Amino acid sequence: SPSINVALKAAFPSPPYLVELLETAASDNTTIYYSLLDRIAKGHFAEATTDKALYEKFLEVLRDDGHMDPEALSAFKLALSLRTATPRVEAHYQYYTATVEPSLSGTQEGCDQWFLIDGEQYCSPTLDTSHGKVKGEDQLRTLPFDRKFGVGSRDVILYADITSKSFAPFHEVAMDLAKKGKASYRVRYRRSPSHSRESLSVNGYGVELVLKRTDYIVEEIADIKPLEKSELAALGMKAASFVMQSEKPFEALLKLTQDFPKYSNSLGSQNVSAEFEAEHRGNREVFLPEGSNVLWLNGLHLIDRQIQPFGLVDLLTRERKLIKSVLDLGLTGQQAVDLLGHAEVAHAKSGDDEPRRFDWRDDIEEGQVIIWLNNLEKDKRYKSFSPSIWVLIHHFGHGLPQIPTGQAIDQAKVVYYLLENYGLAAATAYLEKSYEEQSTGQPNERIFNEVIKDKSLRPDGVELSFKDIFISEKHEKQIHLSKHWVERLRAGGDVPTVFFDGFPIPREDNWLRVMNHRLMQDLQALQQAGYFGMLNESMWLPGFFLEKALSRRNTLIFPEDKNELTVLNVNKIYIENHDLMSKVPVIEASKESTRDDWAALTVVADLDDIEGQELVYYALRFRKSNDGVRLDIVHNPKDTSRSPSVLAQRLKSREDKLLDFTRFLDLETALETGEFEPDVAYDASLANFLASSNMKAGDNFVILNGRVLGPITSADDFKKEDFEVFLQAERRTRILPVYKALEDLGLDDKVSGPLSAAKLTSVTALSTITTLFKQWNSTYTSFEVGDASTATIFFVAVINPASEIGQRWVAVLKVLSELEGVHLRVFLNPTVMIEELPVKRFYRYVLSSSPSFDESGKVKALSARFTGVPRETLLVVGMDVPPAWLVTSKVAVDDLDNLRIKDIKAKRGTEHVEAIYELEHILIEGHSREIPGAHAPRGVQLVLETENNPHFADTIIMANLGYFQFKANPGVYNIRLKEGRSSEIFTLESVGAKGWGPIPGDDNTEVVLMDFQGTTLYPRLRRKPGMEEEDVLEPSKTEHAEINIFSVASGHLYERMLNIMMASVMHHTNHTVKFWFIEQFLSPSFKDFIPHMAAEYGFKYEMVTYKWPHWLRQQKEKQREIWGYKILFLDVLFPLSLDKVIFVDADQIVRTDMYDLVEHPLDGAPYGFAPMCDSRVEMEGYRFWKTGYWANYLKGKPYHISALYVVDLQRFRELAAGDRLRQQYHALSADPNSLANLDQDLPNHMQFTIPIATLPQEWLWCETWCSDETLKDARTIDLCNNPMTKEPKLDRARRQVPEWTKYDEEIAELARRVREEKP
Ligand SMILES: *[C@@H]1O[C@H](CO)[C@@H](O[C@@H]2O[C@H](CO)[C@@H](O[C@@H]3O[C@H](CO[C@H]4O[C@H](CO)[C@@H](O)[C@H](O[C@H]5O[C@H](CO)[C@@H](O)[C@H](O)[C@@H]5O)[C@@H]4O)[C@@H](O)[C@H](O[C@H]4O[C@H](CO)[C@@H](O)[C@H](O)[C@@H]4O)[C@@H]3O)[C@H](O)[C@H]2NC(C)=O)[C@H](O)[C@H]1NC(C)=O
Ligand SMILES: *[C@@H]1O[C@H](CO)[C@@H](O)[C@H](O)[C@H]1NC(C)=O
Ligand SMILES: [Ca+2]
């Protein structure tokens, strides 16, 4: 059985297992954390000798103390396997090593643990002696990995090595100190020297074995893949049946999908067709197309990018908390999910995606407020352009079908008057003259009188009123009616509001862009009504939108920031604060009212303020009208030290008599009368409620069915009419869809009142901040795993057996199916359209559902082991790693790009291959924006730093999404703008570590990574005083080497040729040279060899890499990836400190001193290339760059070669050439046959937009296109492809160049010299 084994190890040592289990066990719950910290401080976990025993002990403890149930325990095992907590612990260590140790005064011997109080270190719990005054920045800032126990004026921090017994007494000193309330307690970690410096073995990634020869196409134990004629069509269909027939189908799919290329000809055997599933063709015809992969998690639709083990563990965790909340009202997990993803519920989300409009009309203000800028039927511009509705309906494309302040008050009077008697043009005239001549809003009669004198065009109708305005009706009615319009729709303030077809669009940045989007969306909405005959010939088009429009607009109910929405769990509120909610004044909703009428309202208000008590009167008024509402009042006062229980006690006595207040003073007087004893138990539950609900003191809030609006600054903002619309809108979206769906399932017996109903509606709203597949028959295409009756998690997978994406999905889903309380149901849907081979690779996923232990009890390493490997097939090893990870090969003796078992058996003697990779870096990536006119600042330079070193890394901001990235490991970092033009123009207020926001408390520039998902940021940069400047326009040798050359090689041969290339440079120059390599495409054999090349030849080297952005279009073929790396990331791949770089292609040899290329002036161009040889006389026919596409495009410009080129990096960055290359590539890449060789084709396609300096032809020689006479004056040779010959590259080198062997001999003896340095 010939096998292949691949493993991955992290760039940091494995933290002690004990501390890892503490962190994994208490994911984010602090009570579990310190409750377990007590247990290990007893010395309770000291008797467990091995990792297995230690793990075993935690299971009994968590179960016994009530921390976890079976479902949460199973989730703990999987998260523990994933080693999710390891980077979180390493964050503590990096912080401790880089900021604590260099800032700590005093000798450290005996000070294993020590509290830090007021910049003083105490090595003893008794606090007798202080060793030092700690230097550096403030350590008391609360950062992401911190935990706090208790509230205290003083802040105490304990840096402990938990492993030893010396920890226990220190802990108890501050645990009790926090329990009393003297100070707040928090624990930080210290690197424990008891543990070894062994690296960490990781999992949650995939390995692929790609077939590199796919040209072929016209039982167990196979030698090679046999290719067949165009009978591919049945592969998916027959493959799907095989599984159904097996009767252990889950295992069959995994076994088939992992080694699929090998089983191709093995399919179609033993009466294979068996189309019993002929009824399920209707399944594919009604909902999803054939061959498509779709996954659902309790209705939630997931794409491939969202399917990572780390991200999926967090989804289950969030989902269980949500469902447990539901099943406290007697609902099964099955009933609960069914209600959440019900059709009537999903319809409401789509319904509220469709915007609601507001009545912008003059009708209320008697038509004397808004000035109609244009008129389509009476303007004499559009008049004759067909006045028909069918002109609008019969349309396609993007064409147009046709048919506050004092000065403002005065100028409104002026314009209004001037319009009324004289007309629009005369009013227009005043405005235009005022703009140029006076240039201010202030009323000018010197300018006004001139307008009456010139534009006095027959003022008909009502007579003129002359020069001065103070009209009792004109000034009063018109101006105050205008104010009533602005107020009604909240169209003023700091940010005014524009209304397009009754849709509010705030006057900010690119509102026209938003307007255009709705303009097209409204047009398509009209067309569909017209085709169905909904519309008629005599109709006003704007009134179709005004059908459901509301007259008044409340910014609280309908915020312009559509994200702004907050809902609380109602069930939680009445069990957490039962002491409070059983003593609040409650007006029960009438029992003799209907379920549809039912709703639950709670008003939180400061009754010691006029606004707070005004708001309650309106709520009481609203309750008289609506018999179905159940009201609560509570009382939240701003003033502290005065008991809130007294005013609540005043009202609960009058509770029976509530809403019998003929006038407002009756409520005012009820608050003042009565003598009461403060229930201090009530006061305690009251302040706990506000803390849980994140509410401040003296702030007014309104809660209907869990949804909260507030804080209410003025009670005039929320009136009786505002409660009615709030109930109307809320009712529609959340209450009505819950009621229908609930009744359809037959759960409408569980609703016993308004409070009972609110629990359900409030929970379903929290779920989003579909069950369309239940229509499908399941008998012949589906299979289930896990108990549906007990399961809380329901997975629905729709996998196509012939897909490569399916390979990953099955492997991950099998491990998640092993969890207790999870149900999985699978659908197989293949395609009949198979033009090429469906799966061209073997796949294995490294993941375990529970930790694995050694024979010695240690934690087992996790690996991808392939056991069904064909001996004669050429394979490529690839890593399918989570997006935040950067991975390279570290240990391998064979060529991972060219694997063959028969050659390894004939050279090494073994049919078993082992390779190890390294998770070298984890990404810090973000999306930047300018402030306040938010756009991507391109060309901006950034620096990442740490307290130890102020220059960890550097990158530049991209145009697309303001993208940037850094390569880093767990720890505390900071982002500063690079010294120069960047800091001159900008200042960055924040790095968006909390979200898009701004969330309060995020005015920070600190970044920390404590997860395998890296760190996602949304930084903000605001321009410095009065700047419209750009980093482009006016207001390396010492660091690296004389010459900087970069290259890339794929195979052992290309790496061997790369060794020759570097040597030829060295022999041919008495200068300093530095070599740069694209790190991830090189072999470990080459990687381990270079220091020996560097010692012999006297050069410097540096490994560089960049991770292919998620937005940027991928390359499925690795050779295409390599080409992209040479052209797409030139500006970001190399550090800012380097002035220029030169690319030389691996199969090249150089006879010249390479400095000359540096000194060559590039005539203000960012990069320079050499053209194709014309010298060969008889080669012409195969010169394709003088034909059709290339000759039409390159009218006079040359066809350049990407074998050798210069990049003036400083100018490249300055010109921002990279951004243009990237977006043109992405745009061109939609067509698959777009770039044959992108590396050559992209600079050639961009040479008119981006200048290309052309090089002397002395710089390149190739036998194929240059004459033999030419080689005497040749500087460098590429070894250009045949193309009509058969001689290989090894042959050309020895025949074409005689000194090639001399270079090869030097490397050969050195390799042997190195080989004898191991026994
Ligand atoms: C962080 O992790 C910890 C640990 O898991 C969680 O903290 C603790 O969780 C446990 C549950 O695992 C809590 O105790 C349980 O409480 C339930 C509920 O019953 C009643 O008791 C509550 C107080 O314990 C109280 O809030 C409610 O009481 C009502 O009635 C009183 C009447 O006087 C009234 O005053 C209140 O206002 C309430 O109206 C509540 O109804 C209880 O059922 C549990 O008993 C279990 O016992 C065994 C297991 O030992 C089991 O066999 C039984 O079936 C039963 O289920 C248990 O007492 C504990 O109070 C929590 N402590 C803290 C500090 O939180 C924490 O919730 C996690 N947080 C997060 C975010 O995950
Ligand atoms: C489900 O199966 C029945 C026969 O049992 C068939 O009539 C029906 O059309 C099928 N539905 C779909 C969507 O294929
Ligand atoms: Ca070459």
mmCIF file of N, CA, C and O in Angstrom, residues 976-1017:
data_model
loop_
_atom_site.group_PDB
_atom_site.id
_atom_site.type_symbol
_atom_site.label_atom_id
_atom_site.label_comp_id
_atom_site.label_asym_id
_atom_site.label_seq_id
_atom_site.Cartn_x
_atom_site.Cartn_y
_atom_site.Cartn_z
ATOM 1 N N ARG A 976 1.208 52.752 12.471
ATOM 2 C CA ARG A 976 1.520 54.166 12.295
ATOM 3 C C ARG A 976 1.738 54.458 10.806
ATOM 4 O O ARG A 976 2.280 53.618 10.086
ATOM 5 N N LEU A 977 1.299 55.636 10.333
ATOM 6 C CA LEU A 977 1.510 56.032 8.937
ATOM 7 C C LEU A 977 3.012 56.228 8.727
ATOM 8 O O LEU A 977 3.675 56.787 9.602
ATOM 9 N N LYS A 978 3.555 55.756 7.598
ATOM 10 C CA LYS A 978 4.985 55.888 7.332
ATOM 11 C C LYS A 978 5.421 57.345 7.275
ATOM 12 O O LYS A 978 4.725 58.167 6.676
ATOM 13 N N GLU A 979 6.568 57.664 7.918
ATOM 14 C CA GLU A 979 7.159 59.008 7.947
ATOM 15 C C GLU A 979 7.414 59.474 6.518
ATOM 16 O O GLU A 979 8.067 58.769 5.749
ATOM 17 N N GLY A 980 6.899 60.644 6.179
ATOM 18 C CA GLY A 980 7.067 61.198 4.847
ATOM 19 C C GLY A 980 5.828 61.915 4.367
ATOM 20 O O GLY A 980 5.206 62.657 5.129
ATOM 21 N N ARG A 981 5.451 61.686 3.109
ATOM 22 C CA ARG A 981 4.288 62.317 2.490
ATOM 23 C C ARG A 981 2.970 61.869 3.127
ATOM 24 O O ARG A 981 2.047 62.673 3.274
ATOM 25 N N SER A 982 2.900 60.596 3.534
ATOM 26 C CA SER A 982 1.712 60.009 4.153
ATOM 27 C C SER A 982 1.316 60.710 5.447
ATOM 28 O O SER A 982 0.158 61.103 5.588
ATOM 29 N N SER A 983 2.270 60.892 6.379
ATOM 30 C CA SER A 983 1.981 61.595 7.629
ATOM 31 C C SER A 983 1.798 63.106 7.411
ATOM 32 O O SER A 983 1.131 63.754 8.213
ATOM 33 N N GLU A 984 2.366 63.657 6.322
ATOM 34 C CA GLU A 984 2.228 65.058 5.949
ATOM 35 C C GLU A 984 0.764 65.341 5.579
ATOM 36 O O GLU A 984 0.181 66.287 6.102
ATOM 37 N N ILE A 985 0.160 64.511 4.712
ATOM 38 C CA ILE A 985 -1.222 64.733 4.288
ATOM 39 C C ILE A 985 -2.276 64.216 5.272
ATOM 40 O O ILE A 985 -3.296 64.878 5.472
ATOM 41 N N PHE A 986 -2.055 63.036 5.861
ATOM 42 C CA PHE A 986 -3.062 62.424 6.723
ATOM 43 C C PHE A 986 -2.692 62.215 8.190
ATOM 44 O O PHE A 986 -1.526 62.260 8.576
ATOM 45 N N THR A 987 -3.731 61.942 8.992
ATOM 46 C CA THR A 987 -3.702 61.528 10.384
ATOM 47 C C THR A 987 -4.783 60.444 10.496
ATOM 48 O O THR A 987 -5.905 60.659 10.014
ATOM 49 N N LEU A 988 -4.439 59.252 11.026
ATOM 50 C CA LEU A 988 -5.456 58.209 11.142
ATOM 51 C C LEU A 988 -6.058 58.207 12.543
ATOM 52 O O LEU A 988 -5.357 58.027 13.537
ATOM 53 N N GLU A 989 -7.353 58.513 12.612
ATOM 54 C CA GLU A 989 -8.084 58.569 13.873
ATOM 55 C C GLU A 989 -8.229 57.182 14.489
ATOM 56 O O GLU A 989 -8.161 57.034 15.712
ATOM 57 N N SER A 990 -8.451 56.169 13.641
ATOM 58 C CA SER A 990 -8.680 54.826 14.129
ATOM 59 C C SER A 990 -8.352 53.714 13.138
ATOM 60 O O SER A 990 -8.295 53.913 11.931
ATOM 61 N N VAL A 991 -8.141 52.532 13.695
ATOM 62 C CA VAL A 991 -8.010 51.259 13.026
ATOM 63 C C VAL A 991 -9.316 50.583 13.467
ATOM 64 O O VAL A 991 -9.593 50.508 14.665
ATOM 65 N N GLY A 992 -10.165 50.228 12.520
ATOM 66 C CA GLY A 992 -11.492 49.699 12.816
ATOM 67 C C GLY A 992 -11.556 48.290 13.357
ATOM 68 O O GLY A 992 -12.139 47.405 12.728
ATOM 69 N N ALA A 993 -11.002 48.084 14.550
ATOM 70 C CA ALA A 993 -10.955 46.785 15.211
ATOM 71 C C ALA A 993 -12.284 46.346 15.838
ATOM 72 O O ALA A 993 -12.419 45.192 16.236
ATOM 73 N N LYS A 994 -13.249 47.254 15.947
ATOM 74 C CA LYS A 994 -14.559 46.933 16.509
ATOM 75 C C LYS A 994 -15.603 46.653 15.416
ATOM 76 O O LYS A 994 -16.552 45.908 15.638
ATOM 77 N N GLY A 995 -15.393 47.226 14.242
ATOM 78 C CA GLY A 995 -16.256 47.064 13.086
ATOM 79 C C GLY A 995 -16.187 48.271 12.177
ATOM 80 O O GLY A 995 -15.305 49.121 12.326
ATOM 81 N N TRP A 996 -17.129 48.363 11.228
ATOM 82 C CA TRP A 996 -17.244 49.500 10.316
ATOM 83 C C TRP A 996 -17.512 50.765 11.159
ATOM 84 O O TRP A 996 -16.817 51.757 10.994
ATOM 85 N N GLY A 997 -18.424 50.657 12.126
ATOM 86 C CA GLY A 997 -18.761 51.699 13.091
ATOM 87 C C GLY A 997 -18.877 53.127 12.589
ATOM 88 O O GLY A 997 -19.470 53.350 11.532
ATOM 89 N N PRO A 998 -18.372 54.145 13.333
ATOM 90 C CA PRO A 998 -17.605 54.084 14.595
ATOM 91 C C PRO A 998 -18.356 53.652 15.851
ATOM 92 O O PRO A 998 -19.331 54.281 16.257
ATOM 93 N N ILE A 999 -17.863 52.585 16.480
ATOM 94 C CA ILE A 999 -18.369 52.095 17.755
ATOM 95 C C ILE A 999 -17.614 52.911 18.799
ATOM 96 O O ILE A 999 -16.401 53.070 18.663
ATOM 97 N N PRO A 1000 -18.271 53.449 19.844
ATOM 98 C CA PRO A 1000 -17.523 54.206 20.862
ATOM 99 C C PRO A 1000 -16.431 53.356 21.509
ATOM 100 O O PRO A 1000 -16.608 52.153 21.686
ATOM 101 N N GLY A 1001 -15.295 53.975 21.796
ATOM 102 C CA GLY A 1001 -14.159 53.282 22.389
ATOM 103 C C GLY A 1001 -13.205 52.669 21.380
ATOM 104 O O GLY A 1001 -12.297 51.925 21.759
ATOM 105 N N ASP A 1002 -13.390 52.972 20.088
ATOM 106 C CA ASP A 1002 -12.533 52.427 19.043
ATOM 107 C C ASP A 1002 -11.543 53.438 18.455
ATOM 108 O O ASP A 1002 -10.960 53.145 17.414
ATOM 109 N N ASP A 1003 -11.409 54.640 19.057
ATOM 110 C CA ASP A 1003 -10.481 55.685 18.599
ATOM 111 C C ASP A 1003 -9.078 55.253 19.002
ATOM 112 O O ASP A 1003 -8.417 55.869 19.835
ATOM 113 N N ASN A 1004 -8.653 54.161 18.403
ATOM 114 C CA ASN A 1004 -7.462 53.422 18.711
ATOM 115 C C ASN A 1004 -6.688 53.081 17.469
ATOM 116 O O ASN A 1004 -7.255 52.962 16.387
ATOM 117 N N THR A 1005 -5.400 52.853 17.638
ATOM 118 C CA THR A 1005 -4.561 52.402 16.542
ATOM 119 C C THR A 1005 -3.841 51.091 16.915
ATOM 120 O O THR A 1005 -2.788 50.783 16.366
ATOM 121 N N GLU A 1006 -4.433 50.304 17.826
ATOM 122 C CA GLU A 1006 -3.854 49.065 18.304
ATOM 123 C C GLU A 1006 -4.512 47.869 17.645
ATOM 124 O O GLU A 1006 -5.737 47.789 17.594
ATOM 125 N N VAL A 1007 -3.700 46.921 17.171
ATOM 126 C CA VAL A 1007 -4.195 45.674 16.594
ATOM 127 C C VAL A 1007 -3.603 44.497 17.352
ATOM 128 O O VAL A 1007 -2.441 44.536 17.739
ATOM 129 N N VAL A 1008 -4.415 43.476 17.621
ATOM 130 C CA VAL A 1008 -3.985 42.286 18.356
ATOM 131 C C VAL A 1008 -4.536 41.059 17.631
ATOM 132 O O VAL A 1008 -5.725 41.069 17.289
ATOM 133 N N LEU A 1009 -3.716 40.000 17.412
ATOM 134 C CA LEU A 1009 -4.277 38.791 16.820
ATOM 135 C C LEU A 1009 -4.125 37.633 17.785
ATOM 136 O O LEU A 1009 -3.048 37.349 18.298
ATOM 137 N N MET A 1010 -5.265 37.054 18.115
ATOM 138 C CA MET A 1010 -5.425 35.976 19.083
ATOM 139 C C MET A 1010 -6.344 34.883 18.540
ATOM 140 O O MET A 1010 -7.029 34.215 19.314
ATOM 141 N N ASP A 1011 -6.367 34.701 17.214
ATOM 142 C CA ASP A 1011 -7.200 33.695 16.582
ATOM 143 C C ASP A 1011 -6.611 33.220 15.261
ATOM 144 O O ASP A 1011 -5.798 33.909 14.645
ATOM 145 N N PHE A 1012 -7.031 32.029 14.830
ATOM 146 C CA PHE A 1012 -6.640 31.458 13.547
ATOM 147 C C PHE A 1012 -7.376 32.111 12.359
ATOM 148 O O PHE A 1012 -7.144 31.731 11.215
ATOM 149 N N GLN A 1013 -8.277 33.062 12.627
ATOM 150 C CA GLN A 1013 -8.976 33.826 11.604
ATOM 151 C C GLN A 1013 -8.293 35.190 11.339
ATOM 152 O O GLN A 1013 -8.812 35.989 10.560
ATOM 153 N N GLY A 1014 -7.143 35.431 11.972
ATOM 154 C CA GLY A 1014 -6.386 36.660 11.833
ATOM 155 C C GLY A 1014 -7.085 37.844 12.460
ATOM 156 O O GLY A 1014 -7.764 37.703 13.478
ATOM 157 N N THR A 1015 -6.928 39.020 11.849
ATOM 158 C CA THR A 1015 -7.558 40.243 12.332
ATOM 159 C C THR A 1015 -8.100 41.062 11.167
ATOM 160 O O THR A 1015 -7.368 41.359 10.223
ATOM 161 N N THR A 1016 -9.394 41.395 11.220
ATOM 162 C CA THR A 1016 -10.034 42.181 10.170
ATOM 163 C C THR A 1016 -10.248 43.601 10.679
ATOM 164 O O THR A 1016 -10.781 43.796 11.769
ATOM 165 N N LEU A 1017 -9.770 44.589 9.921
ATOM 166 C CA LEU A 1017 -9.816 45.987 10.337
ATOM 167 C C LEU A 1017 -10.520 46.874 9.331
ATOM 168 O O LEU A 1017 -10.499 46.593 8.146
#
